[PDB]
Amino acid sequence: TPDVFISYRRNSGSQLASLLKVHLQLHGFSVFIDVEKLEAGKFEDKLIQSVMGARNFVLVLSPGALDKCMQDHDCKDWVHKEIVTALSCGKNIVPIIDGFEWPEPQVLPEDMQAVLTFNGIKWSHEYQEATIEKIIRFLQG
Amino acid sequence: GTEVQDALERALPELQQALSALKQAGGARAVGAGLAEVFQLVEEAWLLPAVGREVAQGLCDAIRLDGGLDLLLRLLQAPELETRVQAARLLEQILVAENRDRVARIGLGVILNLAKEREPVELARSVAGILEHMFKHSEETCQRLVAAGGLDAVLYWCRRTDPALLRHCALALGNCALHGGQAVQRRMVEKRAAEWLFPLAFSKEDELLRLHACLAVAVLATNKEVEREVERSGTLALVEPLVASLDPGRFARCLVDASDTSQGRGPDDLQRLVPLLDSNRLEAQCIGAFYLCAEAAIKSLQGKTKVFSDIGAIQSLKRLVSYSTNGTKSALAKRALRLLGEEVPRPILPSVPSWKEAEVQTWLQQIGFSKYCESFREQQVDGDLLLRLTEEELQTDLGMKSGITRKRFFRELTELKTFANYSTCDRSNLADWLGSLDPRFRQYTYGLVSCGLDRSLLHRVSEQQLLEDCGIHLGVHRARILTAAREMLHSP
Amino acid sequence: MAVQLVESGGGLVQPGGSLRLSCAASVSISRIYVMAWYRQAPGKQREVVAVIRYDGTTNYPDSVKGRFTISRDNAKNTVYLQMNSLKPEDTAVYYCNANVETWGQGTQVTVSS
Ligand SMILES: NC(=O)c1ccc[n+]([C@@H]2O[C@H](COP(=O)(O)O)[C@@H](O)[C@H]2O)c1
Fold it and tell me: Is the C or the N end of chain C the one with fewer CB within 10 Å?
């Protein structure tokens, strides 16, 4: 059973997710990554399984392509669905930010996104093994 | 001959120029220029694709025997790093097997002490290339660089962002499972190398890095004792859609348009990749075949195809296309063969339905059931009667009393049935249609064509007819044939 | 495909002593499904001596198990049968066989002094 799940934007935020997965697997936490469920995963054959098996939902906030999730009220937005399912289940939501463009409260309405009520973690590039001990905290598996 | 000389006419007194400048030291102001003069154009000897590749390799004894590499390795202990970072490049650029043997003999330990510094990326790049070309020496040096801190450096550099450094690391990690035997491959998973190859394999920035990382992980998952640990890493799944999507023509165009990495693996140690084609793991076979057809498509545009002749690699490709159950591997092998200018071998199968009594006697002798030959001789059984032989007629008319004997006979019978030639009676080619779903279904292709069943007549069948007329006894096989047959209901 | 086979070797050997027989084909030996070596005693029926399939899986009768060895070579397409310890009862005409129908010509083998 995967302990945590990491979601990411397909274009940006791909290498950092792999570094997180390799360090977290070296820490032993059963982590599940998910790749390219745009039309295949639409049947929730893996989505609900991942968001039920994962106790701590993780987010990588790279410079983000939130354009599909912001100024888009549509309920067919794939990234918005896979984020609001974790928001609705209300498990441990810890994000990792990397100089991301901060969103405005006027956009991403309260019924769309409420993840702004949390404080993420800033990634380091010089020495990485310091922040990992701070990401092992705030898990509560 | 003539092209060979034009390379060393400039190369030789200019590599002497180099020697001169190496061992004539004006410290930092003059070693710098010398290194740039010998970096700009010595590496351009790999930019002459006509001759000048071989020339370098052979010409490395004029540098190594005089002691120039040894002289600079004795002078690379200078405390300043600026005149060392630009100097370590020509080390990896002038590393060939003969130059490798003496550095593996004497001078080991300055690289192990220079690998302690991992901050400068321009330095770490050259050290990664040094370890890449040093891995491939022999078993003892592999055991010494795994027993020392050699693996930790390239394992730490996997968290970087430099493209050239990550490519050199990917190429470095793959020269260890080749020259490591089995215990070093059992230590590499203990040193957690297969997990740190996930970022180098999952990289949508360069496809070259993905191919190098997937070949590096596939050459290591052939050991059965560590296979159960390599699948736990989460990387053994990435090699299949990688080799599925990527076309070797595209990868060739990405190798022929780049100014470097031409003639990648070469005729020297390519043979280490050959047993991976014959290995048990299918993904190692497909990645080896992919690399072979890619370098063949590269090398076919020139007249260098004859280096396939004296190494006998075309023979190994021709032996693996017939009697092979792998769509991707056989497809890539047939593509390589047809692109290199050779024909695909067709299997020679025994035409069982057009047999006489003598052939039945000989086959009974071959399978070890000779005791019953006379019985088969008395009843006048030939191939047509043999392929439609049932258990009750076997028990009563032919005298096989035991049930275990009849199970053994039907085992040999099915093995002969899947490997027969039905072209004498099968017109609509039902054997390949049955073999497409599973090879183990080909054994039924006689019963079907004996019961006047055709492709165009196959979708309007019932399971009862398959059971009693065509003699298919396993319910699983009947269900699979039914669901695969009625899906193409009215396609014509 | 009309495949022609040729056999070579044989003659007279001393009782106890080795010999090697060879069968050469006219096509690539890797295309053929099964190859085999048969023995015909004077005035009796044939017997099988050695079998080999396309993946190199061999089977011998219990009498010659441990004394005879069959192997195929792909450089020059030839199947070899090596006999190590010969007994006086191994005097016969030997054949090679491709698939089950293609026969060879056969060679005489005697063991005496
Ligand atoms: N395309 C090539 O093969 C190529 C390109 C640039 C440099 N080199 C140098 O050629 C040498 C080849 O030596 P080995 O193939 O014996 O490892 C190395 O020192 C390498 O750095 C090769």
Answer: C
Resolution (in Å) of the shown entry? 3.7
> Which residues from B are below 8 Å from C34, CB to CB?
350, 366
Indicate yes or no: CB of B318 within 8 angstroms of CB of C27: no
Rounded CA-CA distance C23/C72 in Å is 9
Report d(CA B397, CA B412) in Å as an integer. 19
Size of interface A-B (CB pairs under 8 A): 29
A4 φψ region: left (φ > 0), alpha (ψ -120 to 50), beta (else): beta
Residue whose C-alpha is closest to residue B307's, from B280, B277, B283, B271: B271
CATH number at residue C83: 2.60.40.10
Domain of residue B53 covers 1-107
Best residue among B99, B133, B263, B273 to mutate for probing ligand 1, ranked by most atoms within 8 Å of CB: B133
Q: Please, where are the H alpha helices in chain A? A: 15-26, 47-53, 78-89, 132-135
Active site residue ranges of A: 82
Residue B407 CB partners (closer than 8 Å, separation 6+): none
Q: Is the CB of B58 under 6 A from ligand 1?
A: no
- Partners of C13 in the beta sheet? C111
Is B381 a member of any domain?
yes
| Cα(B98)–Cα(B78) distance, integer angstroms | 26
Task: Select from B350, B355, B362 the Cβ nearest to the Cβ of C33.
Answer: B350
Chain B residues whose beta carbon lies within 8 Å of the beta carbon of residue C31: 322, 345-348
B434: number of Cβ within 10 Å: 20
Rounded Cα–Cα distance for residues B158 and A128 (Å): 12
Same domain (yes/no): B410, B451: no
Is the domain of B411 the same as that of B439? no
Token output for C28: 């690539």
Q: Is there a contact between B210 and B203 (Cβ–Cβ < 8 Å)?
A: yes
CATH number, domain of B380, equals 1.10.150.50
Residue C91: give the domain boundaries: 5-111
Residues 6+ apart with CB under 8 A from B58: none
Joined together, the tokens standing for residue A20 give: 């997180």
Question: How far is the C-alpha of B401 from the C-alpha of B375, rounded, in Å?
Answer: 13
Q: Which of B87, B107, B127 is the last residue of a domain?
A: B107
Taking the C-alpha atoms of residue A117 and residue A122, their distance in angstroms, rounded to an integer, is 16
How many domains does the structure of chain C reveal? 1
- Residue B302's SS3 state is coil
Q: How many CB atoms lie within 10 A of CB C16?
A: 11
Bridge partners of residue A121, in order along the sequence: A96
In this structure, the answer to whether residues B11 and B88 fall within a common structural domain is yes
What six digits make up the tokens of B158? 């996997």
Placement of tokens 């010969």 in the chain: C86
Phi, psi values for residue C34, rounded to 5°: -135, 140
Element spanning C110, H or E: strand C107-111
Number of domains forming the structure of chain B: 3
Does the residue B134 lie in any domain?
no
Enumerate the residues of chain B whose CB falls inside 8 A of the CB of residue A14.
Answer: 202-204
Domain edge (last residue) among B418, B440, B462: B418
| C-beta atoms surrounding B413 within 10 Å | 16
Any idea which residue has 């027969």 for tokens? Answer: B420
Structure tokens at B469: 């007329």
Q: At B101, which amino acid appears?
A: D
Q: Which of C27, C30, C65 to mutate to test the interface with B (most CBs of B within 10 A)?
A: C30
Longest alpha-carbon distance in chain B? 101
Q: Has residue B78 been placed in a domain? A: yes
Measured from the Cβ of residue B155, the count of other Cβ atoms closer than 10 Å reads 19
